[PDB]
Amino acid sequence: GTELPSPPSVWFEAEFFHHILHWTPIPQQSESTCYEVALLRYGIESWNSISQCSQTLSYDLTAVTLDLYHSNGYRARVRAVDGSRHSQWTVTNTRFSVDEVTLTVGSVNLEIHNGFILGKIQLPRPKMAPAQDTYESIFSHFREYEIAIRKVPGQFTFTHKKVKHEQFSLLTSGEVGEFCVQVKPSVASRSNKGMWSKEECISLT
Amino acid sequence: GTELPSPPSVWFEAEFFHHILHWTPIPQQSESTCYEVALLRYGIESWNSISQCSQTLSYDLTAVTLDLYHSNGYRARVRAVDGSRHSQWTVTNTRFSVDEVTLTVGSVNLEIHNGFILGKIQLPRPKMAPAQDTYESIFSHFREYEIAIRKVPGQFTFTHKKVKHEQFSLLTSGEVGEFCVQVKPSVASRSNKGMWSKEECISLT
Amino acid sequence: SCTHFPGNLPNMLRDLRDAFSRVKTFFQMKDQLDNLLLKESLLEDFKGYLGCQALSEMIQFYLEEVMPQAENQDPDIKAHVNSLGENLKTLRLRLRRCHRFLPCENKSKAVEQVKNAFNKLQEKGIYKAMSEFDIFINYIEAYMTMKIRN
Amino acid sequence: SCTHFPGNLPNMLRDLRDAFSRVKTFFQMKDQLDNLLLKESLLEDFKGYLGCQALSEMIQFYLEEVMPQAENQDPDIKAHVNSLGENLKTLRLRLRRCHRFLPCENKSKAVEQVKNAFNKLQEKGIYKAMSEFDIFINYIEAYMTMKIRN
């Protein structure tokens, strides 16, 4: 008991340039207790402290890992601090590389033409992203998208289509109404998971 | 004796596009006897008769082997013919390829300048040589020459120099007189033999 | 066969990564050193003209030294690791069978037929191959000039 | 070493031909067939992008199959033939040690150091090489893109 327990586990949860570190709290922690976040860059044996004390269970490590998509990844660790005592470090189990970045889209605006609707998939352009590092730049090729379409006056069902461009079209057979769209991105060569986009409908009428 | 003896041996003797076949006579041959010259092109099992009867011990096979420096060589044979009887064929022992062509020069004109004389090595340009096949064309690189210089008022001695161009210079230190030159060509990558060129002097005075 | 490579590879790399993640945590939790082994130098060799030979060697390195000695140590993942190996060989195969991706592992057509033609001779072939050594030297000398000249 | 090849080769080819003529007549008198074995196809492979691999194979063919089986049959020239072999190896050596003449026979620098670095680890290397498999896949995928794109 002369020791302070360590965080059960530390793991990254990231989107394109939204690299957030997470960790579970120590069993029954006081409010005076905080976590210290450290950072290691693979290939260099040197741990750095990003935050000496954070009263949270998450920490946006973006700023200190902006050169991730041009590296071999990192390693993070967290230990609890209370008074003058602290815990052993709890390090992420895997190496945080570009393989743990959940793919997502910037947005998807739509247009009503004729027997179809066409959509453009605006890719994510986070402010923290240094201009040289655009999505199309990092994932230069094999970018694909899953399209879920939903007729608004209707039930909660979806038609699934698969496109290999940031641009697509949907046949508006005849019927009017409204069409809600959502996309999920991937890169055919990578096995990264993706998050479905926010609904995005358009008043055909 | 019901048989007619075969030529002891058949061998090529060639210069750039001067591919002459040679052969020793059969022991004690009559004058009614002549030799028949045949020709085979390596890679094609087919013997052709160039001359059905030649009252000689040589035959210029140039015309029927003008594509030698662009082939894998030939094979020749000769048999004696007298009346209605002939001999077994005597074929060249080796395959006649570009490796059996004795190198030679066309000519070497000289000019008297200052403390030196400069010579240009005019390469052989035989009439039978199809224009596309020049010496510099066949032996594209590694062409070298041995230069033997002789002071005319003098004894029969020579200074040897080695050049790697068809053009060279010789220091006329001071003394006057006359300078006789002769060259022997080779190709640094080939082991072909070469024949010294005809004397070629110049009146310095 | 080979559609002289349009794009069937993407999925093959994905299969490879997918095959890896099933052993990722294991080895990454297990490896507590932070120095880089596959130095970027390897990448520069891959991006070098010896690249092909670099890629074949590394692939051989994993299938012959690493993966074999790993499943050796801990047979738990011995399955998942071997599967990544089959998954890696399926990759190599599709590579050395198309769009100049692994030429440094391909037999030569001519050299095969010429070997067949020889073997089909025997005593006669041992003589015709040697009596053609001059032509040989000639071809080599041709191959060379394709570098010291146009 | 290698002066990244200026020209020391010419003489090496000459040595080769010179080494051959001492067995030329023998094998050429002995070979009474008139069909070409080293088909011009071999030359076209040499003049092909698989060329290097073509040249290495043929050279191996002569030093391992032909020359060995020839000296086998008639030990008279067994000496002169072997000498042409030493003469042929001296040629190959000078080739795979310079001006991209025989890259398809050269070990890779990176792959050597990386092997040394590994072997110098042992238990630890078996884990760090596997936990870096993702980087590996990444380098390969890099090598590939150098062909399907600029």
Swiss-Prot record, chains A, B:
Disulfide bonds join C34-C53, C180-C201. GO terms for biological process: cytokine-mediated signaling pathway; interleukin-10-mediated signaling pathway; intestinal epithelial structure maintenance; negative regulation of autophagy; negative regulation of inflammatory response; positive regulation of receptor signaling pathway via JAK-STAT; regulation of synapse organization; response to lipopolysaccharide. GO terms for cellular component: apical plasma membrane; cilium; cytosol; nucleoplasm; plasma membrane. The keyword Metal-binding does not apply. GO terms for molecular function: interleukin-10 binding; interleukin-10 receptor activity; signaling receptor activity. Primarily expressed in hematopoetic cells including B-cells, T-cells, NK cells, monocytes and macrophages. Not expressed in non-hematopoetic cells such as fibroblasts or endothelial cells. It is found in: Cell membrane; Cytoplasm. The keyword Transmembrane applies. Phosphorylated. Phosphorylation of the cytoplasmic tail induced STAT3 activation. It comes from the Eukaryota. Glycans are attached at Q28, Q52, Q88, Q132, Q155, Q167. Residues 1-205 are extracellular. Keywords: Cell membrane, Cytoplasm, Disease variant, Disulfide bond, Glycoprotein, Membrane, Phosphoprotein, Receptor, Signal, Transmembrane, Transmembrane helix, Ubl conjugation. Belongs to the type II cytokine receptor family. It is linked to Inflammatory bowel disease 28, autosomal recessive: A chronic, relapsing inflammation of the gastrointestinal tract with a complex etiology. It is subdivided into Crohn disease and ulcerative colitis phenotypes. Crohn disease may affect any part of the gastrointestinal tract from the mouth to the anus, but most frequently it involves the terminal ileum and colon. Bowel inflammation is transmural and discontinuous; it may contain granulomas or be associated with intestinal or perianal fistulas. Cell surface receptor for the cytokine IL10 that participates in IL10-mediated anti-inflammatory functions, limiting excessive tissue disruption caused by inflammation. Upon binding to IL10, induces a conformational change in IL10RB, allowing IL10RB to bind IL10 as well. In turn, the heterotetrameric assembly complex, composed of two subunits of IL10RA and IL10RB, activates the kinases JAK1 and TYK2 that are constitutively associated with IL10RA and IL10RB respectively. Interacts with IL10. Interacts with IL10RB. Interacts (via its cytoplasmic domain) with JAK1 (via N-terminus). Interacts with BTRC; this interaction leads to IL10RA ubiquitination and subsequent degradation. Interacts with STAT3. (Microbial infection) Interacts with human cytomegalovirus protein IL10. This is Interleukin-10 receptor subunit alpha. It comes from Homo sapiens. The lineage of its organism: Eukaryota, Metazoa, Chordata, Craniata, Vertebrata. The gene is IL10RA.
Curated annotation (Swiss-Prot), chains C, D:
Disulfide bonds join C2-C98, C52-C104. GO terms for molecular function: cytokine activity; growth factor activity; interleukin-10 receptor binding; protein dimerization activity. Produced by a variety of cell lines, including T-cells, macrophages, mast cells and other cell types. It is found in: Secreted. GO terms for cellular component: extracellular region; extracellular space. Keywords: Cytokine, Disulfide bond, Glycoprotein, Secreted, Signal. Homodimer. Interacts with IL10RA and IL10RB. Major immune regulatory cytokine that acts on many cells of the immune system where it has profound anti-inflammatory functions, limiting excessive tissue disruption caused by inflammation. Mechanistically, IL10 binds to its heterotetrameric receptor comprising IL10RA and IL10RB leading to JAK1 and STAT2-mediated phosphorylation of STAT3. In turn, STAT3 translocates to the nucleus where it drives expression of anti-inflammatory mediators. Belongs to the IL-10 family. This is Interleukin-10. The gene is IL10.
